[PDB]
Subunit: 116 residues, 4 copies
């Protein structure tokens, strides 16, 4: 898969399990069209969101439901979600790993972009 | 002010200067209504976005134009911007500092919520 | 001062208060000589560690006692501390702010080097 | 292996390749004894540092040579290295992944600790 999401929990030092992830792609009319969705596994990973054929050039948004994650652990976090927005495939097809590191009042996100 | 934004540049080890920042409030129809904006100062700070009277409870989005910043420095960036979405809440402390740390392919953001 | 330390808590969304910080300078024999120390303020800041005269070029280590901080909050931490090791250099800007962002199993540190 | 190190470059959005890593363990006399060393692979990973038998309880230091990494890319970075110090195995054997994210003037580090 050309798009993978990996989420870690900085409080527990663990993968962030069962985190909902929604992906959108900006349409020609500038709206966000639903593209794919899933939830992270026991390893904090979400694979199989898309395919090489489908994942064309465009502006994509990956919205990670961090608030539901923290709420289920009894925590009222600051952010509603973590949303990473990016242009994909503009110099040709690439593989993207979107890595997120979560704390109740902070998150970081990083992209690892490789040429397949 | 109840809301301040502070932006640092992890490549240069400096405040991130002249970064455009837009603030939006979520409307009843779930659209984002522009609320305030500015550019960060020589110290990477943006003050005076709102007032205590105006900044009522709601869902807010702070959009930091990281892409234009990296473009101005001749460095290829990954993100279109960094968005920071949160519910502002009266019961808690209520001065918010949104701190962001920028790299071309990574950012972190943290909230410092006080008094 | 030429050196300031600012520490934030990513769990509480607050300055990290009363965190012990020790500064060391690398000696000629490669050992670390204690130089200065303090505890962060109510704003998570530690000022006045050194002076422009004293803070000559050399290799410095700032050790932030994160473990005692998490212990004080009843939260299990991973690291013994966060160390920040750098060469201080006259040609460049020379006011250093060491910013640290703390979580129980993660920390980040950044240098803001100005004027 | 109970200890793995993974290093990413936040400027290029890539693994950080050929980064030297030195591991030390605190001795009974409070000195740092050399424990293991290696360098990151093309995937930014360093495997095989130790074994279950060898990796007993103790205080360990993982020193990642970030300065040489940046210097080889023409950059004069702020830090001499990234050094992550931690007590290991104090509630029994665990697997540790030490993840580091590098920028010229900043780094973050995170531990993922799992029960084998
Ligand atoms: C929020 C903030 C306040 C501050 O006050 C000290 C000053 O203005 O001199 C000084 C600095 C440098 C920051 C920014 C900061 C301070 C600490 C920190 O962990 C982070 C994370 C985003 C990496 C950011
Ligand atoms: C992206 C990624 C890939 C990975 O490969 C799987 C494995 O080898 O276990 C293993 C891990 C732990 C990560 C996550 C990671 C790896 C490095 C890193 O600096 C960061 C920051 C976002 C904190 C995250």
């Amino acid at each position: 898969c050309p798009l993978m999401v990996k989420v870690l929990d900085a409080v527990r030092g663990s993968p962030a399990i069962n985190v909902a992830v929604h992906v959108f792609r900006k349409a020609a009319d500038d709206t966000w069209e639903p593209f794919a969705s899933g939830k992270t596994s026991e390893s904090g990973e979400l694979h199989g969101l898309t395919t090489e054929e489908e994942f064309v050039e465009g502006i994509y948004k990956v919205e990670i439901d961090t608030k539901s994650y923290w709420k289920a652990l009894g925590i009222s976090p600051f952010h509603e979600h973590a949303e990473v927005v990016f242009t994909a495939n503009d110099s040709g097809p690439r593989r993207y790993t979107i890595a997120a590191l979560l704390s109740p009042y902070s998150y970081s996100t990083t992209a690892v972009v490789t040429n397949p």
